[PDB]
Amino acid sequence: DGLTAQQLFNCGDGLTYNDFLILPGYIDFTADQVDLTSALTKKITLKTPLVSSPMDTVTEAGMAIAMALTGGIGFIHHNCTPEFQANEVRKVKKYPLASKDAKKQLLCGAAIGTHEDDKYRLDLLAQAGVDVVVLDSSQGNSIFQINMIKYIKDKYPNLQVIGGNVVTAAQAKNLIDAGVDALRVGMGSGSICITQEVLACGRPQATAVYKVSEYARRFGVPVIADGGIQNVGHIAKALALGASTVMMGSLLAATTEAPGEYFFSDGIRLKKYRGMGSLDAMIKVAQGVSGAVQDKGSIHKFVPYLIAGIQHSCQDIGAKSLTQVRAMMYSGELKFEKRTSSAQVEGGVHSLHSYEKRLF
Amino acid sequence: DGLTAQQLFNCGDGLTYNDFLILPGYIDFTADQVDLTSALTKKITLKTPLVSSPMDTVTEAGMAIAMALTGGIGFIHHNCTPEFQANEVRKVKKYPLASKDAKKQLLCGAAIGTHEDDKYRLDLLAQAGVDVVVLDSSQGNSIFQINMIKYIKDKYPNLQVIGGNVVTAAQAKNLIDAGVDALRVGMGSGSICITQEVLACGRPQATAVYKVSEYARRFGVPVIADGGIQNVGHIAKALALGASTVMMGSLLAATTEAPGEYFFSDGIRLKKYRGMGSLDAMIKVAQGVSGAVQDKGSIHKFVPYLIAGIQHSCQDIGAKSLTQVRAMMYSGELKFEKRTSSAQVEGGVHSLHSYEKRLF
Amino acid sequence: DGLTAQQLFNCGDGLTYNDFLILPGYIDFTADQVDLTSALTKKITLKTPLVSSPMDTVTEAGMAIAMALTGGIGFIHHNCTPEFQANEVRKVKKYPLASKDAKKQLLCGAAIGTHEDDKYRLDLLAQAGVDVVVLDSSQGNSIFQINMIKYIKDKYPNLQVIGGNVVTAAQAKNLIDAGVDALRVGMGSGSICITQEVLACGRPQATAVYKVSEYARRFGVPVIADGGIQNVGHIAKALALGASTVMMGSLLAATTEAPGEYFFSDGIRLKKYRGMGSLDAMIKVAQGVSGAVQDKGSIHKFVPYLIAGIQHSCQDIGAKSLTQVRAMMYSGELKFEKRTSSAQVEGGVHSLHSYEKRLF
Amino acid sequence: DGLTAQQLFNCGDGLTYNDFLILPGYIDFTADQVDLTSALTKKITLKTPLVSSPMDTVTEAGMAIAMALTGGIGFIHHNCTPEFQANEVRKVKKYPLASKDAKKQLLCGAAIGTHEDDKYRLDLLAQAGVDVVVLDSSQGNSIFQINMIKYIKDKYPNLQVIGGNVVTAAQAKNLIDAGVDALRVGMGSGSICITQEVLACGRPQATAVYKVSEYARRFGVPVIADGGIQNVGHIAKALALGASTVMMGSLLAATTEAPGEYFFSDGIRLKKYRGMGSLDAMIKVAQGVSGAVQDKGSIHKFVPYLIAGIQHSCQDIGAKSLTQVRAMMYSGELKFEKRTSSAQVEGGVHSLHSYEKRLF
Ligand SMILES: NC(=O)c1ccc[n+]([C@@H]2O[C@H](COP(=O)([O-])OP(=O)(O)OC[C@H]3O[C@@H](n4cnc5c(N)ncnc54)[C@H](O)[C@@H]3O)[C@@H](O)[C@H]2O)c1
Ligand SMILES: NC(=O)c1ccc[n+]([C@@H]2O[C@H](COP(=O)([O-])OP(=O)(O)OC[C@H]3O[C@@H](n4cnc5c(N)ncnc54)[C@H](O)[C@@H]3O)[C@@H](O)[C@H]2O)c1
Ligand SMILES: NC(=O)c1ccc[n+]([C@@H]2O[C@H](COP(=O)([O-])OP(=O)(O)OC[C@H]3O[C@@H](n4cnc5c(N)ncnc54)[C@H](O)[C@@H]3O)[C@@H](O)[C@H]2O)c1
Ligand SMILES: NC(=O)c1ccc[n+]([C@@H]2O[C@H](COP(=O)([O-])OP(=O)(O)OC[C@H]3O[C@@H](n4cnc5c(N)ncnc54)[C@H](O)[C@@H]3O)[C@@H](O)[C@H]2O)c1
Ligand SMILES: O=c1[nH]cnc2c1ncn2[C@@H]1O[C@H](COP(=O)(O)O)[C@@H](O)[C@H]1O
Ligand SMILES: O=c1[nH]cnc2c1ncn2[C@@H]1O[C@H](COP(=O)(O)O)[C@@H](O)[C@H]1O
Ligand SMILES: O=c1[nH]cnc2c1ncn2[C@@H]1O[C@H](COP(=O)(O)O)[C@@H](O)[C@H]1O
Ligand SMILES: O=c1[nH]cnc2c1ncn2[C@@H]1O[C@H](COP(=O)(O)O)[C@@H](O)[C@H]1O
């Protein structure tokens, strides 16, 4: 009855989060007894598996503080001067589940590129007290990224470095050999991303998260699942497939703590959201779009809802912690099954004249 | 020519009712010679395979009386004070194919939870003379449900108990060992249900109905197929896959006997219909939506139409009774075949400028 | 390179006409050198493979005359008094590729049921000079149809009888043993049919046409492909899969010779079209809808377009006659390939702001 | 990890460009170091892989000059007098990556049919100095085309002849034996083509491009991929599957250099675009539609964008030239993976209220 993850993904099919479900297990505990403790890198641990994306319409100091206070972490974007990014990290560091360091200050992440401006940008961020840095690229398996990783681990031996983006075990081997402390996974699955239309390169997100995690777990390197998360079930699926944490953009967009002001159109409230490879953000080929997302309220209200939903999902599948979810996934005890297009219709809201969908 | 059910469902695919058809057989009898007699539990038998769902917008005493008079049964909902549910059961018991007990009163079902308030609710329902009780949960394979079943079978040895919801043979083993008299099958396939999108857990309904019934038939325990029934063909498919009875919500919603008033919107008549896990019905995470369904008239006219349609379907496939349909299915005499997206388009109404679809 | 029909259909998939294509061959002749001569029954031959459906919104004497004059045949419907159907057959018989009998009168077909009124209806049609009769049923594998066939072949040994509808080789065995002269194939594929929705019984049309023809060719019994023909490519596919002739409803509906008046709605011209199992046409369960189809002009203009299109299709696949098309299909010389949903999008009109589709 | 092209296309599935992706490789060079040099025929080489289609709404002398100046080539259409086509070729020959001949004049292509008017049309095009000629047919594997090829290679031994259209290795064998210098590939995949609807004959474009190229590479004969190119990723996929050059219609339609005037509808600017087999372009059966495409600016701006996009795609997959892309594809070093319908949705723009899509 059911299929194990190894035989679900080694079929060669192009599986996404919407193409499968997890089969229910046995329940002998309540939902809020479930532990969501998660390893971000080899040496940084969070109370929750949630990470904010380093985009200029998603993460500044206000978003980073709110994610850290709710038990996650925020990565500040680099579409600004080195001075500005360092000042934002300083505001986070100088501000029950809160994510904190050895001095009891909030944890903060930052993003950098792989050019020579980024070697100076790194120094300002290290002086500002950054806890972890992510090399922000579409295709992280490059000589430019490998030279940047080898430079950082020599200059600042204490710093935690996240490599990527990657979608295959061959790409992960080079970055793990180069000494990264974690891997960012996904290519083209993001809500605002058109990289697969424009360059024919990418991967369906569920098989990518599963494949890279199966290779990376052998070296003690955790995986961050990034792009294409639309709901709490997508977070549960990403963690169940081997990811240690989940990074999101559009799902945290249009919250009170996200950068940019609110506006009105068609009688409803909106906030701007755009890809870092859109012409708006940057002979010059575009890799993303710019648009808008509906208002979602404060992260101090929305993150507790995601936490309750992940706990309820772990209870339905029979696991007391995310560590136990991944252990029963790799051992073949957790079970999955595919969905046909008809099953996807049967699984959504159907056969009603009209309906109202409130989540919490 | 064609595939048996055993080789149709052991392929590992995510099959739903819309993904297959039943191949025609040989006809040597008229349609109204077909017998629809069905076992609800180990000791309760109905003239028809139809069951009303225990939802607050579907089953109260008026709905339960009409279903029993038409040869089916109604399960009264528990989103009310225990006094009110016992009084509704009392009104059903105080009221040619009618479903009745040894005292010649109509048969009545009731629903309860698995908390400690439900031990008191159970005693009032037993006082009121209830014939069968269903433990109403999204994931019935739990210590809470198993302790509730073992308590009921000791306190009232005469009472018939229905377990679930379940979608796998591993879940059914625990409830059959605990002593249930029938199993409720389905998770997330309901018209008003978003559990699969919020918690990533569930199963396509046709494979769930087929697999739980194949395990349960060996212990003499019948199966009730619940959620995702849109038409008479779905009822015929559910019974052909091994189910003894079929439970529906939205298909019996907006009938004259269902609870709640009628109202007009967009020039047409409607009645409210909602999931028991919707915020409207019940820090708190929603598992269903609330909406509306178009008016359908009285169950005293609508149920006879479903009965005639199931008889016509049994005639087309060559069987004189539902018992014979399940016997031909398990022996490999009955045949099935898959449908691609193009076959589903060819099977619906197509190639017309406009059309009118009256069923009876 | 490519797949033979035997290995395309013995995969167990639910294939429809839209799910595959025919691979091109070698051309050494012009398009109008192709011969479309087709056997309707064991003793009736037509210049073309086209047959009009016996529906009350499709075939009366005017349609039957035009179909016969253009090289096909028309089957008159039975939703009228036996007197009226016999008078319509009389008007066809009383009237360069024209379909004619030994007396040089036009050929005419008629439809009858399997009840005892039909034994009298048959005699009026036989005296009216009918050339062939079809038993008009949704599921022709019945004791009622077998007794009717055995009665007709004894009463009128000269009469040609078409059995069906069938979709499997097991159904065809009984009717071929009973002595039918041809088989009508298809169940639920028609434009106005909801039999699969309501009774769960039917079959995808391309696999049904292929499987019944493969069994029937061994006894010299031809096959008529009926229901779900939307364009000339569907006619070419039906003939290539083993059918001797193709029957259509909606494709010949709203022509000048079809019964019923024209009317205007939404600024365009329409004619009524309905299923024989719709409540409009006939305690009672509906098996079809009633609607409308856009005007197509005269059959004396429209049938020549279908003839030219089938000749062009035979030229592209490399065959000088329909006999040679079926010979290369059964020998494995003709090749086919499957289509994914994306291939169906690439195969239709795509990537335009607006367009106009003119066929001839 | 991933599938090679040989095992992706030998599955028998109906694959299109949208049904797969290319997995990323290793990067150790910048994007504008990538070489796009491409062989058009056995003796003509271009700086870029881009070709203009010979359609009356796409290629006249203005379009041919602009494509040649940007490093590609244009084929002039033949839906005009032979005198007019020769005069257009004359204007192209009379006019840093520019495509040129031994006399340092721009390269020019022309189209001809397989009738006896075309033997005279050929002589005027040779008079005018044409560099290459394409035999313009829907099904090029015919006695008419083979006699035309054998006539041209004897009359003008210096002329380069392109055969087709073909979609199978059996069709290519006859034209390669006849002595063609290149093959045009595709049937029914074009934006304005309904050949698969009307004649049931054609092939999904990605499998056709891959299979004809695998057979043709053994004889040193290059392949031109024609029809169904919607974006830069489609060009990258076509070249990666073995094509030497890519031909497009709709993607170059509504540019400043394309023939026909601009017009306004619904507040936007448009230009007419139609299939050569539409009734507008030419008892007669249509094989294409006529419509409109939105304005796209000058080819001197649009072609550089396509060049930058193909270079970026080659960089993401790890290749310094198109020659190396095809070498990694045939050796099994390049990797691909399939996409389910859900993966195609995840890969496009999703989960936004509104968005703006600018490419450059
Ligand atoms: N799937 C994804 O994750 C994805 C896809 C597209 C864009 N994006 C987002 O958009 C942003 C842009 O991504 P990107 O990949 O263009 O960033 P990038 O700076 O790596 O890309 C610039 C290009 O210049 C080249 N380059 C990079 N570093 C270099 C160096 N040191 N020397 C010489 N050449 C060098 C690379 O080949 C690269 O294609 C990213 O921050 C990312 O978050 C993400
Ligand atoms: N697929 C489905 O069938 C489905 C899915 C969702 C909701 N529903 C409907 O919505 C209603 C709500 O379903 P539900 O599963 O939330 O009901 P429930 O009362 O079982 O759920 C409440 C939660 O509290 C916990 N719990 C239950 N009994 C307990 C006890 N005795 N002690 C301690 N903890 C206990 C359980 O872990 C459960 O998740 C149901 O009546 C059902 O009809 C159905
Ligand atoms: N897929 C299809 O081809 C399809 C499906 C539905 C309807 N239809 C059309 O609608 C019309 C109605 O079809 P139908 O199958 O209902 O016709 P029918 O007269 O065969 O059906 C009437 C019912 O009465 C019973 N019956 C038939 N003859 C009998 C006899 N001699 N004695 C006792 N009982 C008998 C049969 O079991 C049948 O279900 C047909 O003419 C057909 O063209 C076609
Ligand atoms: N998939 C495709 O590539 C496709 C499909 C349809 C149309 N088209 C376009 O439309 C145009 C029309 O295509 P077409 O195939 O009809 O051109 P065509 O001139 O080859 O077709 C005319 C028909 O006449 C016949 N014929 C051709 N040459 C002959 C000769 N010398 N003697 C006797 N008979 C002869 C052929 O059988 C052919 O079907 C083409 O230029 C093409 O670009 C393309
Ligand atoms: O412009 C872009 N194109 C493609 N991907 C991008 C772009 N900008 C950001 N991304 C990715 O998109 C993710 C956010 O996707 P989302 O959570 O689905 O909304 C980011 O974390 C990046 O991995
Ligand atoms: O809130 C909810 N979420 C999910 N499933 C529910 C909920 N409430 C009821 N159900 C299920 O939905 C079924 C009715 O589904 P329907 O017949 O498709 O309309 C019920 O019998 C329950 O099994
Ligand atoms: O009411 C009905 N329900 C289902 N099938 C029918 C009905 N009436 C006619 N048919 C079938 O529909 C065919 C016509 O289908 P069409 O060519 O697709 O429009 C007829 O020849 C019959 O086989
Ligand atoms: O009328 C027609 N029907 C079918 N295919 C055609 C027709 N006219 C041109 N073609 C093909 O369509 C291609 C252009 O397709 P596009 O690039 O997708 O817009 C041409 O290069 C021809 O191969």
The CATH number for A227's domain is: 3.20.20.70
C12 among annotated binding-site residues: no
Query: How does DSSP classify residue A218?
Result: G
A247 among annotated binding-site residues: no
| Active-site annotation of B, residues | 193
C-alpha distances in angstroms, B35 versus B304, B310, B322?
14, 10, 7
| Ligand that comes closest to the CA of residue C34 | 4
Query: How does DSSP classify residue C32?
Result: G
B276 among annotated binding-site residues: yes
Method: cryo-EM
Q: Among candidates C359, C330, C137, which has minimal Cα distance to C239? A: C330
**Scanning every residue of chain D, which has its alpha carbon at the shortest distance from the alpha carbon of C236?**
D200
What does DSSP say about strands D50-52 and D45-46: parallel, antiparallel, or unpaired? Answer: unpaired
d(CA C309, CA C315): 10
Cβ neighbours of B203 in A, within 8 Å:
21, 23, 337
Residues forming beta bridges with residue C249, ordered by sequence position: none
Backbone φ and ψ of A115, nearest 5°: -95, 180
Tell the burial category of C354 from Cβ atoms under 10 Å away from its Cβ (0-12, 13-18, 19+). Answer: exposed
Chain D closest-CA separation from residue C128 CA (Å): 37
Q: Among candidates A74, A110, A63, A52, which has minimal Cα distance to A258? A: A63
The CB density around residue A248, as the number of other CB atoms within 10 Å, is: 24
d(CA A164, CA A162): 7
C-alpha distances in angstroms, B135 versus B119, C206, D1?
12, 47, 47
Query: How does DSSP classify residue C162?
Result: E
Q: C277 by DSSP, 3-state: which?
A: coil
What does DSSP say about strands A132-135 and A160-166: parallel, antiparallel, or unpaired? Answer: parallel
Backbone φ and ψ of C73, nearest 5°: -155, 150
**Scanning every residue of chain A, which has its alpha carbon at the shortest distance from the alpha carbon of B197?**
A233
Q: Do A285 and D237 touch (CB under 8 A)?
A: no
Residue B353 falls inside a structural domain: no
CB B155 near ligand 2, within 6 Å: no
Residue D223 falls inside a structural domain: yes
- What are A338's two structure tokens? 């595919």
d(CA A113, CA A137): 7
Of D19, D188, D203, Cβ closest to residue C342 = D19
Tell me the torsion sign for CA atoms A301, A302, A305, A310: negative
d(CA A108, CA A85): 12
d(CA C113, CA A360): 60
**Scanning every residue of chain C, which has its alpha carbon at the shortest distance from the alpha carbon of D15?**
C340
d(CA C100, CA B317): 40
Q: Which residue type, as a one-letter code, is found at position B197?
A: E
Q: Please list every protein residue whose CB sits less than 6 Å from any atom of ligand 3.
A: B 27, 30-31, 315; C 113-115, 136-138, 144, 165, 186-188, 193, 195, 276-277, 287
Residue ranges of the annotated binding site of D for NAD(+) are: 136-138, 186-188
Query: How does DSSP classify residue D218?
Result: G
Q: D126 by DSSP, 3-state: which?
A: helix
C-alpha distances in angstroms, C220 versus A323, C39, C182, C253, C321?
68, 10, 9, 32, 19
Number of H helices, E strands in chain A: 12, 16
Q: Do B204 and A343 touch (CB under 8 A)?
A: yes
C-alpha distances in angstroms, A346 versus A342, A350, B251, C197, D200?
6, 7, 14, 15, 33
d(CA B348, CA B341): 11
Resolution in A: 2.5
Ranges assigned E (strand) in chain A: 20-22, 38-39, 45-46, 50-52, 73-76, 109-112, 132-135, 160-166, 182-185, 223-226, 245-248, 263-265, 268-274, 290-294, 336-338, 354-356
Omega before A174 within 30 of 0, i.e. cis? no
d(CA C62, CA C140): 28
B249 among annotated binding-site residues: yes
Contact D24, A167 (CB under 8 A): yes
Chain A closest-CA separation from residue D66 CA (Å): 18
Contact D138, D165 (CB under 8 A): yes
Q: Among candidates A57, A89, A56, A94, which has minimal Cα distance to A73? A: A89
Number of domains in chain C: 1
d(CA D73, CA D40): 9
Q: Do C167 and B3 touch (CB under 8 A)?
A: no
Catalytic-role residue among A80, A108, A193, A201: A193
Long-range contacts of the stretch C78-85 (C-beta < 8 A, 24+):
C78/C54, C78/C110, C78/C111, C78/C112, C78/C113, C78/C121, C78/C136, C79/C276, C79/C281, C80/C56, C82/C117, C82/C120, C82/C121, C82/C124, C82/C125, C83/C124, C85/C110, C85/C121, C85/C124, C85/C125
Query: How does DSSP classify residue C18?
Result: G
How big is chain D, counted in residues? 360
Q: B276 by DSSP, 3-state: which?
A: coil
Look-up of token digits 């099958």: B185
Find the discontinuities in chain A where C to next N exceeds 2.5 angstroms and give the residue preceding each: 95, 282
| Active-site annotation of C, residues | 193
Look-up of token digits 């199993």: B183
What does DSSP say about strands B73-76 and D245-248: parallel, antiparallel, or unpaired? Answer: unpaired
Q: D191 by DSSP, 3-state: which?
A: coil
Cβ neighbours of A170 in D, within 8 Å:
1, 26
Alpha-carbon dihedral of residues D72, D78, D82, D87, nearest 10 degrees?
A: -30
Backbone φ and ψ of D122, nearest 5°: -50, -45
Chain B closest-CA separation from residue A96 CA (Å): 16
Contact C159, C149 (CB under 8 A): no
Residues forming beta bridges with residue D356, ordered by sequence position: A290
User: CA-based diameter of chain C, in Å?
Assistant: 63
- What are D334's two structure tokens? 């390049």
Query: How does DSSP classify residue D193?
Result: B
Chains in touch with B (3+ beta-carbon pairs under 8 Å) read A, C
Helices (H), chain D: 5-9, 61-69, 82-94, 117-127, 143-155, 169-177, 195-199, 205-216, 232-240, 299-316, 322-331, 341-347
Q: What angle do CA C314, D175, D125 make, to 5 degrees?
A: 105
Q: Which residues contact D316 (CB under 8 A, 6 or more apart)?
A: A138, A139, A199, A201, D24, D25, D27
Q: Do A360 and B283 touch (CB under 8 A)?
A: yes
Q: Among candidates B91, B96, B55, B100, which has minimal Cα distance to B73? A: B100
Q: D259 by DSSP, 3-state: which?
A: coil
Tell the burial category of A264 from Cβ atoms under 10 Å away from its Cβ (0-12, 13-18, 19+). Answer: exposed
- What are B346's two structure tokens? 């060819």
- What are A291's two structure tokens? 């648009």
Tell me the torsion sign for CA atoms B114, B119, B121, B126: positive
Residue A26 falls inside a structural domain: yes
Q: Which residue type, as a one-letter code, is found at position D66?
A: A
Residue C357 falls inside a structural domain: no
Of C304, C350, C359, Cβ closest to residue D191 = C350
CB A247 near ligand 5, within 6 Å: yes
Please give the radius of gyration of chain B, using alpha carbons only, rounded to the nearest integer. Answer: 20
B288 among annotated binding-site residues: no
Q: Which residue type, as a one-letter code, is found at position D129?
A: G
d(CA B207, CA B187): 12
Tell me the torsion sign for CA atoms C108, C109, C112, C114: positive
- Residue to mutate among B6, B15, B16, B21, with most C CBs inside 10 A, is B21
Contact D215, D169 (CB under 8 A): yes
- What are C345's two structure tokens? 């999008």
d(CA A151, CA B196): 46
What does DSSP say about strands C160-166 and C132-135: parallel, antiparallel, or unpaired? Answer: parallel
d(CA B296, CA B231): 13
Helices (H), A217-357: 232-240, 299-316, 322-330, 341-347
d(CA B26, CA B315): 8
Query: How does DSSP classify residue D131?
Result: S
The CB density around residue C43, as the number of other CB atoms within 10 Å, is: 12
| Ligand that comes closest to the CA of residue D188 | 4
Q: D246 by DSSP, 3-state: which?
A: strand
d(CA D135, CA D111): 6
d(CA B139, CA B167): 9
Inter-axis angle of helices D205-216 and D232-240, nearest 10: 30
Q: Do D26 and A286 touch (CB under 8 A)?
A: no
Residue D353 falls inside a structural domain: no
Contact C346, D189 (CB under 8 A): yes
Residue A268 falls inside a structural domain: no
d(CA A62, CA A98): 15
Sheet holding B268-274, edge to edge: A354-356, B290-294, B268-274, B262-265
Q: Do D141 and C313 touch (CB under 8 A)?
A: no
Residue span of the structural domain in which B270 resides? 5-346
Residues forming beta bridges with residue D270, ordered by sequence position: D263, D294
Cβ neighbours of A183 in D, within 8 Å:
none
d(CA C232, CA D199): 7
d(CA C104, CA C93): 10
Contact B185, B193 (CB under 8 A): no
Alpha-carbon dihedral of residues D233, D238, D239, D242, nearest 10 degrees?
A: 150
The CB density around residue A103, as the number of other CB atoms within 10 Å, is: 7
Q: Which residues contact B191 (CB under 8 A, 6 or more apart)?
A: A349, A350, A351, A352, B227, B228, B230, B249, B250, B273
Q: Among candidates D147, D144, D179, D141, which has minimal Cα distance to D162? A: D179
Residue C267 falls inside a structural domain: no
Residue C289 falls inside a structural domain: no
Residues forming beta bridges with residue D99, ordered by sequence position: none
Buried b (16+ CB within 10 A) or exposed e, D131-161: bbbbbbbbbbbbebbbebbeebbeebeebbb
**Scanning every residue of chain D, which has its alpha carbon at the shortest distance from the alpha carbon of A204?**
D343
Omega before C79 within 30 of 0, i.e. cis? no
Inter-axis angle of helices D232-240 and D322-331, nearest 10: 60
Substitution site in C53, C58, C272 for ligand 7 pocket (most atoms within 8 Å of beta carbon): C53
- What are B358's two structure tokens? 């009256």
d(CA D297, CA B105): 82
Q: Do B21 and C200 touch (CB under 8 A)?
A: yes
Q: Do D337 and A199 touch (CB under 8 A)?
A: no
- What are D274's two structure tokens? 């139609």
What does DSSP say about strands B38-39 and B45-46: parallel, antiparallel, or unpaired? Answer: antiparallel
Chain D closest-CA separation from residue A329 CA (Å): 20
Backbone φ and ψ of B224, nearest 5°: -105, 120
CB B164 near ligand 6, within 6 Å: no
Span between the terminal Cα atoms of chain B, in Å:
34
Distance D165 CA to ligand 4 centre (A): 10
Inter-axis angle of helices D61-69 and D299-316, nearest 10: 40
| Ligand that comes closest to the CA of residue B144 | 2
C-alpha distances in angstroms, D3 versus A167, D7, D22?
14, 6, 9
Span between the terminal Cα atoms of chain A, in Å:
34
Q: Which residues contact C108 (CB under 8 A, 6 or more apart)?
A: C64, C68, C73, C74, C76, C89, C92, C93, C129, C130, C131
CA B29 to chain centre: 28
Q: Which residue type, as a one-letter code, is found at position B248?
A: M
**How many Cα atoms sit within 13 Å of C31 on the Cβ side?**
14
Cβ neighbours of B228 in A, within 8 Å:
346
- What are C352's two structure tokens? 């335009």
Sheet holding C262-265, edge to edge: B354-356, C290-294, C268-274, C262-265
Contact C270, C261 (CB under 8 A): no
- What are A232's two structure tokens? 């709490």
The secondary element (H helix, E strand) that includes residue C36 is none
Chain A closest-CA separation from residue B116 CA (Å): 15
CA B202 to chain centre: 17
d(CA D223, CA D212): 8
